[PDB]
Amino acid sequence: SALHWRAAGAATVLLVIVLLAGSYLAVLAERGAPGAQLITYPRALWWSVSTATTVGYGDLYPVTLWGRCVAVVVMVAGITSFGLVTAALATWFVGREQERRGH
Amino acid sequence: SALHWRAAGAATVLLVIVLLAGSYLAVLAERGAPGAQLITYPRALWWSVSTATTVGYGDLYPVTLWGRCVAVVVMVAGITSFGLVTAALATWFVGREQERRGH
Amino acid sequence: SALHWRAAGAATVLLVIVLLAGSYLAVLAERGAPGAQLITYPRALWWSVSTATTVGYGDLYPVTLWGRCVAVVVMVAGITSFGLVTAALATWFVGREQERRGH
Amino acid sequence: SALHWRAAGAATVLLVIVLLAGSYLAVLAERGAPGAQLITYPRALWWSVSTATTVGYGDLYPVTLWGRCVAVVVMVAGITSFGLVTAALATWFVGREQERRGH
Numbered sequence: 001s002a003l004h005w006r007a008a009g010a011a012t013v014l015l016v017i018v019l020l021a022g023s024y025l026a027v028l029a030e031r032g033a034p035g036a037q038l039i040t041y042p043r044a045l046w047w048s049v050s051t052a053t054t055v056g057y058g059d060l061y062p063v064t065l066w067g068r069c070v071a072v073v074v075m076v077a078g079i080t081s082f083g084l085v086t087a088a089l090a091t092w093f094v095g096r097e098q099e100r101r102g103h
Numbered sequence: 104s105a106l107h108w109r110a111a112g113a114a115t116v117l118l119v120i121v122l123l124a125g126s127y128l129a130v131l132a133e134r135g136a137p138g139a140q141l142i143t144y145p146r147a148l149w150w151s152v153s154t155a156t157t158v159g160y161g162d163l164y165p166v167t168l169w170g171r172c173v174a175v176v177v178m179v180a181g182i183t184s185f186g187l188v189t190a191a192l193a194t195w196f197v198g199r200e201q202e203r204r205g206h
Numbered sequence: 207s208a209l210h211w212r213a214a215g216a217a218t219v220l221l222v223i224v225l226l227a228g229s230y231l232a233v234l235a236e237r238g239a240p241g242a243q244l245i246t247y248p249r250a251l252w253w254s255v256s257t258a259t260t261v262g263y264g265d266l267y268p269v270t271l272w273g274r275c276v277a278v279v280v281m282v283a284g285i286t287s288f289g290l291v292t293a294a295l296a297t298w299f300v301g302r303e304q305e306r307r308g309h
Numbered sequence: 310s311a312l313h314w315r316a317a318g319a320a321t322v323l324l325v326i327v328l329l330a331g332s333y334l335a336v337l338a339e340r341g342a343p344g345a346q347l348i349t350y351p352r353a354l355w356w357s358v359s360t361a362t363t364v365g366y367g368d369l370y371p372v373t374l375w376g377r378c379v380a381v382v383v384m385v386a387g388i389t390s391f392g393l394v395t396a397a398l399a400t401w402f403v404g405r406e407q408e409r410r411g412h
């Protein structure tokens with residue numbers, strides 16, 4: 001099992017862990033802030049995933065410092081995780097082309 | 104026809120299929136939810152494509168569990184599909200540079 | 207001048223052309239649609255760039271079929287253009303590591 | 310220390326500098342525009358980071374020419390910086406696969 005595939009797998013599991021951890025921590029950070037909407041777990045998970053994919057509909061978002069810090073972590077984990085999948089695909093293609101070239 | 108170009112082509116066709124399937128399933132999942140707006144097919148397709156590209160204007164979004172699950176599938180298919188195109192471009196450039204180096 | 211750098215340069219010029227063309231065509235497609243906001247050129251250019259980078263604040267967006275089609279073109283051009291820059295960076299790094307390995 | 314890792318490190322520091330500089334300049338550009346909301350530094354930094362990651366919730370955005378120009382710089386720096394991290398990961402994977410192939 002090549003490194004890039006293992007890394008891709010691990011990245012996926014870690015992202016899921018971050019999305020989960022982020023939804024809990026977001027609710028923890030946001031309750032107590034008048035007007036906050038990221039305060040129940042199910043929609044917080046929806047918020048986490050739509051932030052990690054960087055879609056950001058804006059239907060939900062953090063208003064506190066720690067909620068936003070949590071958000072940045074979720075964003076970075078999502079961007080780098082998917083970026084890593086891209087990197088693994090590149091490695092796969094590069095390898096196949098070398099073979100196709102007799103190497 | 105190198106693998107990366109075939110993969111890029113296939114990824115494109117699959118994405119189109121997902122955007123189509125996602126618009127139908129989104130409407131199916133969202134009707135029945137008071138207040139939902141992702142309920143007619145044309146705008147649902149607009150929603151699907153703007154989600155797959157991860158643009159997310161927020162003019163439309165799912166409010167139900169299954170609509171959101173459908174959304175996650177659309178997001179992932181879009182991100183990985185475009186990511187794959189990037190990976191194919193990298194393979195193309197890597198190959199040309201090797202040649203430019205006499206290999 | 208290696209291919210990837212030339213491609214990166216060309217991609218940048220083309221993107222600028224698309225952003226420009228997209229702002230004109232968006233206004234052309236949207237005027238005539240009651241309620242449309244993407245109807246003056248300066249903000250249309252702001253809309254084009256924030257769509258191409260896939261940021262999508264949602265302060266502006268197309269409501270017509272052709273405005274949305276124009277949007278999809280802008281999105282794709284932005285994603286693939288930046289993706290190509292990424293691919294060129296990968297080629298640059300791959301080349302330097304080979305050298306660092308005595309190849 | 311291979312180039313790609315140094316580049317990745319430098320890209321990260323530069324991005325942080327841009328996010329910081331962007332929040333100051335955004336407030337500078339936006340105050341004086343009736344209705345503008347990107348006018349206090351803490352939320353401006355939140356705006357900068359959520360723009361650089363291209364998340365774009367839409368809770369905050371620039372309304373002036375220079376605020377939007379600043380925004381474009383932030384967007385580009387974010388996209389290219391994360392793109393570079395992706396490129397570095399690809400180089401790392403490519404290198405490990407070559408070794409795994411006895412090269």
Ligand SMILES: CCCCCCCCCCCCCC(=O)O[C@@H](CO)COC(=O)CCCCCCCC
Pocket residue numbers: 019020021022023024025041042043045046049166167168171172175
């Ligand atoms: C540490 C933080 C952990 C957070 C864990 C969240 C646990 C929530 C229970 C799970 C589902 C509840 C369903 C429900 O009745 O809610 C629906 C109401 O319409 C839709 O809600 C939602 O928006 C849920 C969508 C979740 C999408 C997840 C995509 C993951 C790739």
Ligand SMILES: CCCCCCCCCCCCCC(=O)O[C@@H](CO)COC(=O)CCCCCCCC
Pocket residue numbers: 122123124125126127128144145146148149152269270271274275278
């Ligand atoms: C399985 C799910 C399938 C969903 C299929 C959708 C079929 C809809 C018929 C198609 C067009 C109708 C036009 C119309 O009169 O609508 C216009 C009204 O202003 C604009 O609407 C729209 O927003 C359509 C924009 C579609 C963009 C698609 C981009 C694809 C890359």
Ligand SMILES: CCCCCCCCCCCCCC(=O)O[C@@H](CO)COC(=O)CCCCCCCC
Pocket residue numbers: 225226227228229230231247248249251252255372373374377378381
């Ligand atoms: C084919 C379509 C072509 C469209 C061309 C657009 C021409 C507009 C003239 C240019 C500037 C006008 C300034 C003004 O007085 O407007 C300011 C008002 O606050 C800010 O406006 C704006 O939002 C302009 C922001 C533009 C950002 C462009 C970023 C490019 C990478």
Ligand SMILES: CCCCCCCCCCCCCC(=O)O[C@@H](CO)COC(=O)CCCCCCCC
Pocket residue numbers: 063064065068069072328329330331332333334350351352354355358
């Ligand atoms: C040149 C421009 C420089 C701009 C520098 C900004 C300096 C602000 C001081 C820092 C924190 C203040 C906290 C506070 O009391 O504010 C909180 C109020 O709820 C949350 O605010 C916020 O939204 C801050 C979130 C910042 C996230 C940064 C993520 C970086 C990767």
Ligand SMILES: [K+]
Pocket residue numbers: 053054055156157158259260261362363364
């Ligand atoms: K995005």
Ligand SMILES: [K+]
Pocket residue numbers: 054055056157158159260261262363364365
């Ligand atoms: K976005």
Ligand SMILES: [K+]
Pocket residue numbers: 055056057058158159160161261262263264364365366367
């Ligand atoms: K958005």
Ligand SMILES: [K+]
Pocket residue numbers: 056057058159160161262263264365366367
């Ligand atoms: K938005």
Ligand SMILES: [K+]
Pocket residue numbers: 057058059160161162263264265366367368
């Ligand atoms: K919005």
Ligand SMILES: [K+]
Pocket residue numbers: none
């Ligand atoms: K809104």
